[PDB]
Design an enzyme around this catalytic site. Structure first.
Site, PDB file in Angstrom:
ATOM      1  N   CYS A   1       0.823  -1.206   0.000  1.00 28.69           N
ATOM      2  CA  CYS A   1       0.000   0.000   0.000  1.00 28.69           C
ATOM      3  C   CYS A   1       0.860   1.260   0.000  1.00 28.69           C
ATOM      4  CB  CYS A   1      -0.920  -0.005   1.227  1.00 28.69           C
ATOM      5  SG  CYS A   1      -2.011   1.427   1.340  1.00 28.69           S
TER       6      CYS A   1
ATOM      7  N   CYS B   1       2.057   2.534   5.862  1.00 26.69           N
ATOM      8  CA  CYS B   1       1.024   1.523   6.045  1.00 26.69           C
ATOM      9  C   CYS B   1       1.594   0.122   5.830  1.00 26.69           C
ATOM     10  CB  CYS B   1      -0.131   1.783   5.075  1.00 26.69           C
ATOM     11  SG  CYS B   1      -1.538   0.681   5.275  1.00 26.69           S
TER      12      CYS B   1
ATOM     13  N   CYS C   1      -6.896  -1.370   0.517  1.00 28.52           N
ATOM     14  CA  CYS C   1      -6.053  -1.774   1.641  1.00 28.52           C
ATOM     15  C   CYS C   1      -6.916  -2.121   2.849  1.00 28.52           C
ATOM     16  CB  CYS C   1      -5.088  -0.642   1.988  1.00 28.52           C
ATOM     17  SG  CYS C   1      -4.041  -0.917   3.440  1.00 28.52           S
TER      18      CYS C   1
ATOM     19  N   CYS D   1      -5.798   0.631   5.978  1.00 26.59           N
ATOM     20  CA  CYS D   1      -6.180   2.036   5.919  1.00 26.59           C
ATOM     21  C   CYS D   1      -7.418   2.299   5.063  1.00 26.59           C
ATOM     22  CB  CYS D   1      -5.003   2.873   5.402  1.00 26.59           C
ATOM     23  SG  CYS D   1      -4.646   2.635   3.630  1.00 26.59           S
TER      24      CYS D   1
ATOM     25  N   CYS E   1      -1.186   2.559 -11.873  1.00 28.03           N
ATOM     26  CA  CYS E   1      -0.425   3.758 -11.561  1.00 28.03           C
ATOM     27  C   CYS E   1       0.477   3.574 -10.353  1.00 28.03           C
ATOM     28  CB  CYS E   1      -1.375   4.944 -11.300  1.00 28.03           C
ATOM     29  SG  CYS E   1      -2.510   5.413 -12.714  1.00 28.03           S
TER      30      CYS E   1
ATOM     31  N   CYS F   1      -7.245   7.325 -14.254  1.00 25.53           N
ATOM     32  CA  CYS F   1      -5.788   7.279 -14.344  1.00 25.53           C
ATOM     33  C   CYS F   1      -5.245   8.354 -15.274  1.00 25.53           C
ATOM     34  CB  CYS F   1      -5.317   5.899 -14.794  1.00 25.53           C
ATOM     35  SG  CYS F   1      -6.040   4.534 -13.851  1.00 25.53           S
TER      36      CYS F   1
ATOM     37  N   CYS G   1      -5.587   4.128 -25.457  1.00 28.42           N
ATOM     38  CA  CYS G   1      -5.801   5.444 -24.868  1.00 28.42           C
ATOM     39  C   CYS G   1      -4.513   6.153 -24.471  1.00 28.42           C
ATOM     40  CB  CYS G   1      -6.722   5.327 -23.648  1.00 28.42           C
ATOM     41  SG  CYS G   1      -5.881   4.569 -22.199  1.00 28.42           S
TER      42      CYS G   1
ATOM     43  N   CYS H   1       2.245 -10.610 -14.107  1.00 31.92           N
ATOM     44  CA  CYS H   1       1.103 -10.556 -15.020  1.00 31.92           C
ATOM     45  C   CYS H   1       1.579 -10.248 -16.431  1.00 31.92           C
ATOM     46  CB  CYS H   1       0.078  -9.507 -14.581  1.00 31.92           C
ATOM     47  SG  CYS H   1      -0.527  -9.737 -12.882  1.00 31.92           S
TER      48      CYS H   1
ATOM     49  N   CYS I   1      -6.746  -2.439 -19.569  1.00 28.92           N
ATOM     50  CA  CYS I   1      -6.550  -1.031 -19.255  1.00 28.92           C
ATOM     51  C   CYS I   1      -7.703  -0.515 -18.405  1.00 28.92           C
ATOM     52  CB  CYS I   1      -6.418  -0.198 -20.535  1.00 28.92           C
ATOM     53  SG  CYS I   1      -6.119   1.579 -20.220  1.00 28.92           S
TER      54      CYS I   1
HETATM   55 ZN    ZN Z   1      -2.961   0.982   3.417  1.00 32.69          ZN
HETATM   56 ZN    ZN Z   2      -4.519   4.588 -12.114  1.00 31.69          ZN
HETATM   57 ZN    ZN Z   3      -6.175   2.378 -22.405  1.00 31.43          ZN
END
Ligand code: ZN
Ligand code: ZN
Ligand code: ZN
Ligand code: ZN
Ligand code: ZN
Ligand code: ZN
Ligand code: ZN
Ligand code: ZN
Ligand code: ZN
Ligand code: ZN
Lengths: 149, 150
Positions: free
Chosen positions: B11, B16, B31, B34, B42, B51, B90, B100, B105
């Site tokens: 996190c 945290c 999380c 928290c 991101c 985003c 995008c 992964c 997206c």
């Molecule tokens: Zn957290």
């Molecule tokens: Zn994002």
């Molecule tokens: Zn995209």
């Protein structure tokens, strides 16, 4: 275009070579270009040990924009806790994806990557007087740990 | 290839202890410590933004704040080094999700093949092999290292 998220890609410019990570393998001899990549430095430094390579990188970083690029990125990774310094010899160690445990290339200390510290106390393997104490009292060194040896 | 394992994310709330394992079809981490929602693409908490808005606002804040600019200049390095890419639809910056090889997206829902740093499919979406990496067509992976790009 590189390779899988699970892979290390060779650093020879435009080389297609790649490998998967293994806990006890810190170097990759690229089968395409035959250069030896160091997986902890993420660099080819065939004439040097890792400490020599990193000290030279910091030196070149004073008069080279690309080396300054590399070093200031390492500073951020260190601060973000994405990389770490070896607790014994203090070289910068970068992550090997999926490996919870690393043996330092320079001083051979076992490192618990999960907790970003030594695996063991000063007595080495089996010394739980220090280190992450994984599974002592049955408790993993961190809940995310799968195998830090 | 490699022994299948789980890859952890921590996190971003300062100090945290919350953490999770990455999953193919999950782009957000709430999380349990928290309760903040982390966006796993991101690697940041941006609960009042999509985003694209977060990344645009981050570039704006880069011109005057020290921490924002070291963050943006790191992303630009990651792009050249290949530890991140832009969504082929995008064009947001997408950071690697450890373990992964496939990513959907968050902004435009295009499926991304991480292995080839491009779209998984052609313009028609899933099943359109007129573009994309064509993984497993005729039993051939999109790249020898591919672990599963769906
Ligand atoms: Zn957290
Ligand atoms: Zn994002
Ligand atoms: Zn995209
Ligand atoms: Zn190579
Ligand atoms: Zn090295
Ligand atoms: Zn060391
Ligand atoms: Zn450990
Ligand atoms: Zn452990
Ligand atoms: Zn693919
Ligand atoms: Zn594939």
């Amino acid at each position: 275009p590189g390779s899988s998220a699970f892979s290390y890609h060779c650093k020879t410019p435009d080389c297609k070579g790649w490998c998967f990570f293994e806990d006890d393998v810190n170097e990759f001899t690229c089968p395409v270009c035959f250069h030896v990549n160091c997986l902890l430095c993420k660099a080819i430094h065939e004439q040097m040990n890792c400490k020599e390579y990193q000290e030279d990188l910091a030196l070149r970083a004073q008069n080279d924009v690309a080396a300054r690029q590399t070093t200031e990125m390492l500073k951020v990774m260190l601060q973000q806790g994405e990389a770490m310094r070896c607790p014994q010899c203090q070289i910068v160690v970068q992550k090997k994806d999926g490996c919870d445990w690393i043996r330092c290339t320079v001083c051979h200390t076992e490192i618990c990557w999960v907790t970003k510290g030594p695996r063991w106390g000063p007595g080495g393997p089996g010394d739980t007087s220090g280190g992450c104490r994984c599974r002592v009292n049955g408790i993993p060194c961190h809940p995310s740990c799968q195998n830090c040896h």
